[PDB]
Amino acid sequence: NLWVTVYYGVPVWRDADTTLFCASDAKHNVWATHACVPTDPNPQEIHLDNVTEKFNMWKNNMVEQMHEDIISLWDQSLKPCVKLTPLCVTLHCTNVTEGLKNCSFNMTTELRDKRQKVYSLFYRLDIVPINENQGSEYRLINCNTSAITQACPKVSFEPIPIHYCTPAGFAILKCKDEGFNGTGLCKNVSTVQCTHGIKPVVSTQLLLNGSLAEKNIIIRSENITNNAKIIIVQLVQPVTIKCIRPNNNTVKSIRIGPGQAFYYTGDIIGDIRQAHCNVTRSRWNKTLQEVAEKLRTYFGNKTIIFANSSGGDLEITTHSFNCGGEFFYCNTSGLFNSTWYVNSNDTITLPCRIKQIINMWQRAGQAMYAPPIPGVIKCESNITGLLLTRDGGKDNNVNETFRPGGSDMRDNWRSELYKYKVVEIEPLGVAPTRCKRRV
Amino acid sequence: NLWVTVYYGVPVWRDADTTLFCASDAKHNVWATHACVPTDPNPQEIHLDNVTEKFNMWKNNMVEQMHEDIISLWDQSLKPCVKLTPLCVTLHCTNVTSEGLKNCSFNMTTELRDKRQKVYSLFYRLDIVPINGSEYRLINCNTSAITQACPKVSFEPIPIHYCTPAGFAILKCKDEGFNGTGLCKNVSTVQCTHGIKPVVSTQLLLNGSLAEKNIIIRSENITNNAKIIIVQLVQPVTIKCIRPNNNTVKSIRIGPGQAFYYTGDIIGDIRQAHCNVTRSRWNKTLQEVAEKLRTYFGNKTIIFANSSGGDLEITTHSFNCGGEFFYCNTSGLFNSTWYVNSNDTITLPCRIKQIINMWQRAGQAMYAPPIPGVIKCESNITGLLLTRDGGKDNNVNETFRPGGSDMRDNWRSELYKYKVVEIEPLGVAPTRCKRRV
Amino acid sequence: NLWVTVYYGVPVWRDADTTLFCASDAKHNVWATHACVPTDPNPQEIHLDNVTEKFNMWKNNMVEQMHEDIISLWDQSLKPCVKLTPLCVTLHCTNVTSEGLKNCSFNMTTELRDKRQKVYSLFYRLDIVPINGSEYRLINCNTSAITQACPKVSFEPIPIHYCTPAGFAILKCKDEGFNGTGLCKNVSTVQCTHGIKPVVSTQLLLNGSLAEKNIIIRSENITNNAKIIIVQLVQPVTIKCIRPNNNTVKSIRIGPGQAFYYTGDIIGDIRQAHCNVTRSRWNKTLQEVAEKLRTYFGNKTIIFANSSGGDLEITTHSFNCGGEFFYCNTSGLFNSTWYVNSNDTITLPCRIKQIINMWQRAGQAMYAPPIPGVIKCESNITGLLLTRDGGKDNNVNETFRPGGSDMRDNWRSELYKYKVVEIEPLGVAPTRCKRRV
Amino acid sequence: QVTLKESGPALVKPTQTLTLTCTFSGFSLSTSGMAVGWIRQPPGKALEWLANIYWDGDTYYSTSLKSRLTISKDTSKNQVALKMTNMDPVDTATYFCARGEESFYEDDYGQMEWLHSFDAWGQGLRVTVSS
Amino acid sequence: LGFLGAAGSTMGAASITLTVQARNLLLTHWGIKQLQARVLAVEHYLRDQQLLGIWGCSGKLICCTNVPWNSSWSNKSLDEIWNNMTWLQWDKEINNYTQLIYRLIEESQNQQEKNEKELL
Amino acid sequence: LGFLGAAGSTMGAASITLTVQARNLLLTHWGIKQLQARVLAVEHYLRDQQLLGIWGCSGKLICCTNVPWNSSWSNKSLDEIWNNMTWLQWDKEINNYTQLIYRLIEESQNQQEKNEKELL
Amino acid sequence: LGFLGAAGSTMGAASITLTVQARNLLLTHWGIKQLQARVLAVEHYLRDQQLLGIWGCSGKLICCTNVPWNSSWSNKSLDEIWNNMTWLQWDKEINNYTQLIYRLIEESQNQQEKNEKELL
Amino acid sequence: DIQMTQSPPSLSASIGDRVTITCRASQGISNYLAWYQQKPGKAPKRLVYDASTLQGGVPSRFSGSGSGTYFSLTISSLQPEDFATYYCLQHNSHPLTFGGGTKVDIK
Ligand SMILES: *[C@@H]1O[C@H](CO)[C@@H](O[C@@H]2O[C@H](CO)[C@@H](O[C@@H]3O[C@H](CO)[C@@H](O)[C@H](O)[C@@H]3O)[C@H](O)[C@H]2NC(C)=O)[C@H](O)[C@H]1NC(C)=O
Ligand SMILES: *[C@@H]1O[C@H](CO)[C@@H](O[C@@H]2O[C@H](CO)[C@@H](O)[C@H](O)[C@H]2NC(C)=O)[C@H](O)[C@H]1NC(C)=O
Ligand SMILES: *[C@@H]1O[C@H](CO)[C@@H](O[C@@H]2O[C@H](CO)[C@@H](O)[C@H](O)[C@H]2NC(C)=O)[C@H](O)[C@H]1NC(C)=O
Ligand SMILES: *[C@@H]1O[C@H](CO)[C@@H](O[C@@H]2O[C@H](CO)[C@@H](O)[C@H](O)[C@H]2NC(C)=O)[C@H](O)[C@H]1NC(C)=O
Ligand SMILES: *[C@@H]1O[C@H](CO)[C@@H](O)[C@H](O)[C@H]1NC(C)=O
C-alpha cells in the first residue's frame, strides 16, 4: 500500500492579488522614489524550462494597483504645495501685444489688508469669459468645480523608472516569448523577484519612452472584434518625436498669503508662436504601412483607414506631454489621416496648445496648475506605442476605420506591464509514496 | 512519581481586550463599508457544552472601542469634502409669510471672491440665535467651525460585523432572559459578532434587537439612581415620523467649488414635525415594563415622568432616519402611573435641527443639508434608556424618567451578549511520563 | 579533528541602527507623554561583567531620531491648536504710555465673518518690523503662517524614555569620568533609556545630567578648532530668571471657537527680563572648567568671549520656563581670562520673544501665548557648549566662544552614555560532535 | 424713516470759502459700514460726485476736486459737513447729501471690501456765485 | 467538534482534539486597525510558540520533560485532574506558579542539551 | 539552481532543490505600503509554517505520515506521479482534496502523540 | 541570572545559560512607529529562526552537523576556544567566515537531505 | 479714473411703448452699478441697484440687465410719470462717477 507524505519548499504557484512596493536606483521628484527602498543591482531573472503559464494582462491586479499608487503619489506630492484659491477673482483681459490673453487683476499680497495689481499672461484654454455679454471680464477655468493647487517649483514630473516588487512569499512571472499577444500560454517564461524599471510616463493617444517589440509589430486586445475595447499597438523600432515651446517666457514671482509664493508668466521676449511637434514623415509613413499590414491580419483582405479622433473634450481628443513641467496638447490630425490597401522637408508638424489648469485623471475634485518654465524649452522622446479604437457601427464591408482611442489611463500602463503577472507560491505539497513514519 | 508535561492547542482562554476591527457585507456611506473588509458569508459559530462564563457587559471594553470607531468613521466622512466655515456672516431674518422657521437673508461670496451675492434661505429657529433688532447669528459659530454634511454619502445605519484578530475569540451568550451580568450557561464562540446597526438614536433604542420571551432590565446597580436602567422589549412598537413640509432645495457656490445646499421655498402649507405611536401597543408595553420593574424592586406603584429637562441634545429623543436629524419631544409617552392592580396613535411634536453635534463634542459641529420633498420614516422601538429619579428617599412610589445623557449606554444594549478573550493554547499538567535522552 | 556546531540564544551583538520608540513615564504635554507606552515599573538594567567595547556618541543614529522625534512631536502638538493666519494684518504702533515694547493697534474679524474689530495690544519690538514709519508688520508673516500653541498645554521638558524593539538592545556606559569616543568599562544593558528630559536650549544645558565625580570635556575632535566642545559640570550652577512686568492677558475670537491671546496691558513700569547667577559660584565653577580645558590642549591663555555675532537665535541663550521664551545676553558670563596661577550676583539682560522658529524651520512659525502675571523660574546649569576660533597660530593665545548652531548636539550631551546594537543570537563554533541518521 | 436734510449759504461771493452741512436721523454713521457723500448737479447738466466719508472717518474726493475739497463728520451731534474753497462761477449748482454703504468680508486668504450705490437723497440746495 | 468546541469537556476528552485549536489560531481607518490586528495575531502566536520551541517540544502537541511535578503547585489527585476537572477550571488552579514552571522546564532543557552535546 | 528554478522539471527532479525555495521565503505612501507588504510576507510564511509544525514535520523538508493514500484522491500509478507529471499540474488534481487531506494528517498525528504519551 | 548576564563570562559557562537569552528575544507618530518597531522585532526573530529550521535544528539550542572544520577559519585549540574566549571576540574573529560558514552547513544539510531520500 | 458713458443721451418715446437705455464703462466694473431717476428739478431716486435687483416699492415696469462693461435699463411699458432723467452710476471702486444722463420725451 501507499501512504501520503508532505514536502516543504515545493515549486508551485497560484494567481492572487497582493500589495506591491516601490523600488528604484539612486528629494525633488513627484514620485518620491528617494523615500523608497533601493533596487537590487542583481535581478535574479531565473529561466524556467518546460513550464507553460497562462497570462491575461487585462485581468491582473498590478495595473489597477499602479493606477492608484500613481494617483496617490500625485496627490501626496501636492499636499504641502501652496494653494491657488485666491486667484479665483475677476480677470480683466486684453489681446496680447491670439492664443494668449494678457490679464490684469487684483491680488492679495502678504499683508492680508492690502491688495496689489498684477499683470499676467494666461492661455485661452485656461480662461473662460464669465459674462458672454462683454469679452473683457474672464474667470479661470475649473474655478467653479474645485480649488486650484499650484505645483511646487522645486519638484519635477520627470518619469524616472520605478520597479514594482512584491513582498517575500510572492513571485512575478515574466513572459520572455517574442511576440506575446498579451493573452495565452507563454511558452518562454522566467521567474524574477520583481519587474524592471517602469517609467510612469503619462500620455494619451501615444506611448512615449516605453518598451519596444522584438522584431514584429504586436497588436494586443482583449477582444479585437469589439469596438468598446481599446487596441494597443507596439512598434518594433522607435519613432523619434521632438517638440518646442518658442515663446521665451519670463517667469515672475509674487508672494500671496503668509509667505506663500506664486509663479506666473510675465512678458514674452520676441515673437510669439504656437507650440508644435515634429516627426519624420518618411519614418512615420513606413510605420503605418507595417502597422496596418499587421492589423489587417485580424480582418482578412480588407483596407485600413485612420481618422483624427472622435471629438469631445480636449483632455481625451489630443496627445499629452510632461515636458519639464509644461503640459502640451497636440492636434494629432496630421498623423492619423491616410488610407492603406493590400499592396500598399520630410517632416510632419503637429499644431499644439499649452494648458496649465489640468487634471490628467478626469477628476473634478482637484485641479492642477502647472507653473511656467522660464526660457525656451525643447522636448524629445521616442514613440513606442499607439492606443487605437475600432470605429464601426455597420457591416465591416471592404473597409474599417480606426481612431486613436484611450479615455482611460489604465491602458497606458497595460502596454508596459503586459510581460508580468503576480502569483502566490504555495511551498506545501502532499504526494504519496511507499514509506511509513516510525512509531 | 509525577512529571510535568506541556500541552499545545489547549482549549482555554483569559479575559483581555484586543484591537477589534470591522467586517461587513458587500464611498457613498458614512460608515465606509467599502473600505471595511468583507464579511464571511458563513460565520462558523461553534456551540460549547458544560462551559459557564462570567459575563459583565458594563466592564466590557469593546463597547468603548466601538464608540471610538464610530466617532473616527464620522470624522473620516466629513473631513474629505467641503467645510462650512464661511457661513459665519451676519444673518437678517423675518417670519415666514405662509414660528419654527425664519426667512433668513445674508450676503455671501459667489464662486469668484471679488463678487458677492445676496441669498434668501429658511433656517429653523433652533439653528438661529439673536445677536442684538432683526439680526441673528448662526448657532455654533462661536464655538466650532461648521462642516456641511456631504450629500454624496448617506447616514443609513448599515450593520457592521465586528471581528477580532486571530488567536482571540468572542464569546456569545445565548441564554434566554440573561441580563447584562451573571454566569451564562449557554455560551457559544464565534469569530465575529452578528450584524449590529450603529443607530445614532438617543433616549430610545431604534431598530435594535428584541428579547426572546420576556422583557429584560439591565443595570450595573439598579438601586443606584445615578445608573442607567436599560430596558428591552419583547415585541417592538412601530413608530412613524414625517415632516409634511415639501422644502424645495437650492444651491450656491461659496468660493471655488464647495457647492452649498440650502432650503428654498416651502411648497404647500407649513406644518410641524411629528411622530405616531399606537396607544394600545405603547400603553400595553408600559404595563409589562412597569410590572417587570415592580417584580425586581419596589413592590408598589410605578410612575413615568416626562424626562428631567435641559438641552434638546440630552432631554429629547433624536434619530437619523430620513437624512435629516429629528428632535422629538417624548413628553407624551412617559405620562402614566402604574399601580399593583394595573387612527388612534399618540402624537409627539418634533423639531428639526440642521446644526448638530450628536456626540456632546463642543469642538466639532456639522450642518445637515436639506432633503428635498417630504420624507417618510418608520422604525421599531426595541428598547429604552430609563433613569430612576432618586433625589428623595422612596416611600411608596418610584419615579422613572427617560434619561441617558451618555452615548456609550445606547450601544451597550446591543453588545450585552459579547465578551472578547485571548486564546491561551499553551498549558501544563502532571503525567507519569519521562522523556528519554 | 573537530566538526561544526551551531548555537542559539548567543550573547553577541553588532553596531547597527534601528527604529526607536518612546516610553514616557506614565494630553497636557508637547511630547505626547500620555500617548507613549507606559514606562517600565523599574529599569531592568543587567550589569555586563568583564565586557569592554568601543562607544561612539558622535556617530550613533539614536541622537538623530531623538531630534526628528522631538520635531514631529512639536508639530503634532501644534496642528490641533488654533492657527493665526488672519493675524497678518498691518499694525499701527506707538511708544508705550508707561523701549522693547510697542503699543500696536490693528484690525481683525470678530467671530462673525462679516464685522471687523479694532483692538490694541503690546508686541515686543523683536517680533515687529517696520514697512518704511508708523506702520509695522509681524515677523515671519512673510515666511509662513503663524500658529498659536494651546495655552492649556505647557512646554515643560517632561522626561521621556527611549526603548528598542525586541532583538535590539542599548548598551549603557557607566565609567566615571567617561569622555566619549573610545573604550568603555563597567558596561550595562537595559531595554529602555532612563528618564531623559528634552531640555531645548542653546549654549547652556539646563536641568541636565551632572558629572559623576569630576569635570568632563567631550568632543569628537578636541584638536579641531571649528567644531563644538561640550563640557559637563559636576556641581549645579543654579540660574534664576524673572520677568518683573506684571502682564495682564486679554483675548478675542478671530474665528468660530478660535480664541487668540495677547498682551493686553502692563501694570507698573516696564522692566527688561534678566537672569541672575551667583558670581562666586560661576567664577569658581568656570575656573575649574578652564583647568580641564587646558589639560586637553594648550597652556594658560584660557579666554572666553561674548559669543560670535549674527542672528539673535544663535548668539543669545535660548531659554524657556512657564511658557515664555527668553533670549539673554550671555556676555556677562564669558568675559574673562586666566593663567596657570588662577552685590555678588551676575545679571544677564534678557529680551522676551513671542514669535519663534524652534528647530530653525522657515516653513513653520510658533507663537507662544503671553502668560499673565509676573513669571519667575530657576534651573540648574549642568553643561556648556563651547567653540573656538583659533585658526591663527595659537603659540601665544587662543579663545573659546559659546554657541553650537545646531540642536542635535543638545541631546548628545545627555545620550552620551548610550549605544544601540543589534542582537544576533545565532552563533557557530567547532566541537567534536557527530550527527546521527 | 431715514431722511437727509442739507443746509448752507444760498449765495457766496467768488474766490471765497464755503461750508455745507447735512443732518441725518435714520442712522448714526457708527453702525460698522454706513457712509455719506455729497453730489452736485449744475442747471440742466449731469450729476457730479464730490466726496464721501465713511463710518471709520475714511474720506474720498473727486480726482479734479481733490485740491479744494474737505469732508468732516460730527457723530456727537449727527452731522456731516463739507468745505470747499476757491469758489468759481462754474461751481454754481444744486448740491445733494446722500447716504452710502460699505461692506467687508474675510475669506481667510485676504480682506475684501465692497462699495454700494446711494439709496436715500436729500431735498438739495442751490448755491449761486454772484459778485 | 469545531474550533474550541471541547473547552467545557473533560481534560481527557479535550486532549484528543488539540490540533483544531492550533490550526484555527491563524477611509483608511479600518485599514490601519486591521493592519495592527494582524500584527497582534502573529506576535501572539509566536509568543506562545517561542516558549514551546525552546522547551524542546517544537512541532509536538503532547510533550513531556525531565522536570518533576511539585505538590506545592497543586495537590489534586491524578485521576481527579484528568477525569473530572476541565481545562478552563484547571488553568485557574495554576494561575500562580505558571511563570515559575516555565523557568524550570526551559533551564532543564539547556543543561539537558549540554549533556547530550558532550555525549554525542 | 536559483530560486524557483526547478518548477518545470519533473516531480522527482523538483524534489532535489527544495532547500533554496524554502530559504528564499524571507514619501508616506511608500512607507505604509512597504509595512503592509512586509507583514504580509511574515503572515504568509507563518500560515504555512504553522501547519508543518503541528503535522510533526517541523524543520523537515521531507516528512512522512501514517495516513493511507485514499484511491478517491487519485488512481494514477506511482511512476506517473514521480516521473512524468510535475507539481504545477499535480496541484490542480488534488486541489479539492487538499483541505480534507490536511484534516486527516492532523487527526492521525494527534492520535500518535496521545498514544506515545500513554505508552511512555 | 538575567538577560545577557553571561556575555562577558567564559565561553563554556555562557553555553549553559542560553535559554534565558532565547526567551527574552521577544499619538499618531508613536502608533506608526511602534507598529514598525513591533514588526521589525518579529522579522528579526524569524530571520534567525528560519536558518535553524531549515538546518534541521528547529527549536534546538545546541546543534551540530556533518561539516568538517577548516583550518582557514581558525586554528585555536579547543581548550582556549571554550575556557579562555569571549563570544564577542570569537564572533569578530570569524565575522568574515560567518556567511561562508553558513554556506557549509547549508551544503552539509543538503547531503543529509540527499541521503535521507534513499533511506525511505 | 473710471469714466462712464451712456446712450442715447436724448430720445423720443411714446406713451405705453417699451424703451431701454444702455450704460458703458471704460473697463470691467463687475456688477457694482445702479441707476437713478430724477424728475425735473427734484432730488434723484434709486430704482435698481447691482444692475439686476429692482428697488423695493418701484413697480415691475423697470428692469436691469447686463454686466462687466455693458449695462442696460429696460422699461416694458411707459406711463406719463416717466418724464424724468435717468443716470447710471458705478460703485466698483473710488472715485465714484455718474453717467452722462439720458432724457426721455414722450411724443
Ligand atoms: C492571442 O492569442 C490567443 C492564443 O494564445 C488567442 O486565443 C484564442 O482566441 C479566440 C478568439 O479570438 C478563442 O476562441 C476561438 O477562436 C477560434 C478562431 O476564431 C474559433 O475557431 C473557436 O471556435 C473559438 O471561437 C480561442 O479559444 C482562444 N484560444 C485560447 C487558447 O485561449 C487570442 O484570441 C489572441 N488575441 C488576439 C487579439 O490576437
Ligand atoms: C527565451 O527568451 C530568452 C530571452 O528572454 C532567450 O534567450 C536569449 O537567446 C538569444 C538567442 O539565442 C541569445 O542571444 C541571448 O543571449 C539569450 N538571452 C537573453 C537574455 O536575451 C531564449 O533563447 C528564449 N528561448 C528559450 C527556449 O528559452
Ligand atoms: C443579573 O442576574 C444576576 C444573576 O444571574 C444578578 O446578580 C445577582 O443578584 C442577586 C440579587 O439578590 C445577588 O444576591 C447575587 O449575589 C448577584 N450575583 C452576582 C454574581 O452579582 C444581577 O443582579 C442581575 N442584574 C440585573 C441588572 O438584573
Ligand atoms: C414635563 O411636564 C410638565 C407637565 O406637563 C410640563 O409643564 C407644562 O406641561 C403642559 C402640558 O400641557 C404644557 O402645556 C405647559 O406649557 C408646561 N408648562 C411649563 C411651564 O413648562 C413641563 O414643561 C415638562 N417638562 C419638560 C422638560 O418637557
Ligand atoms: C570575569 O573574568 C574572571 C577572570 O578574568 C573570571 O574569574 C570571572 O568569573 C568572570 N566574571 C564573571 C561574572 O563571569
Residue numbers in the entry:
A (entry chain A): 33 to 58, 65 to 135, 152 to 187, 187A, 188 to 309, 312 to 323, 323A, 324 to 356, ...
B (entry chain E): 33 to 58, 65 to 136, 152 to 185, 188 to 309, 312 to 323, 323A, 324 to 355, 357 to 398, ...
C (entry chain C): 33 to 58, 65 to 136, 152 to 185, 188 to 309, 312 to 323, 323A, 324 to 359, 361 to 398, ...
D (entry chain H): 1 to 35, 35A, 35B, 36 to 82, 82A, 82B, 82C, 83 to 100, ...
E (entry chain G), F (entry chain B), G (entry chain F): 520 to 545, 568 to 661
H (entry chain L): 1 to 107
From the primary publication:
Envelope complex structures revealed eight different antibody classes (one multi-donor) and the complete repertoire of all five possible recognition topologies, recapitulating canonical human modes of apex insertion and C-strand hydrogen bonding. On the negative side, to penetrate the apical glycan shield of Env and bind underlying conserved positively charged residues, broadly neutralizing V2 apex antibodies must contain heavy chain third complementarity-determining regions (HCDR3s) that are exceptionally long, anionic, and often tyrosine sulfated.
The cryo-EM structures of 6070-a.01, T646-a.01, 42056-a.01, and 44715-a.01 (solved with 3D molecular reconstructions at 3.6-Å, 3.5-Å, 4.2-Å, and 3.9-Å resolution, respectively) revealed modes of recognition similar to antibodies PGT145 and PCT64, which represent an extended human broadly neutralizing antibody class that utilizes a needle-like hole-insertion mechanism to recognize the V2 apex. A single Fab of each of these antibodies bound at the Env C3 symmetry axis with extended HCDR3s inserted directly into the cationic trimer hole. The 6070-a.01 complex revealed a three-residue anionic motif (E100aHCDR3, D100bHCDR3, and D100cHCDR3) to form salt bridges with all three R166 residues, while F100 and Q100fHCDR3 together interacted with R169 from a single protomer, and light chain residues S30LCDR1 and D50LCDR2 engaged K168 and R169 from a second protomer (bottom). 6070-a.01 and T646-a.01 each recognized N160 glycan from all three protomers despite comprising the phenotypic neutralization group enhanced by N160 glycan removal. However, both lineages reoriented one of these glycans outward from the trimer C3 axis (6070-a) or into a horizontal conformation parallel with the Fab-combining surface (T646-a) (denoted with * in Fig. 3, a and b); this is in contrast to other human and rhesus PGT145-like antibodies that accommodate N160 glycans in a more vertical conformation similar to their conformation on the unliganded trimer. The fourth group, comprising lineages 6070-a and T646-a, was distinguished by dramatic enhancement in neutralization potency (100- to 10,000-fold) against heterologous viruses lacking N160 glycan; this stands in contrast to previously reported V2 apex broadly neutralizing antibodies, which generally are N160 dependent.
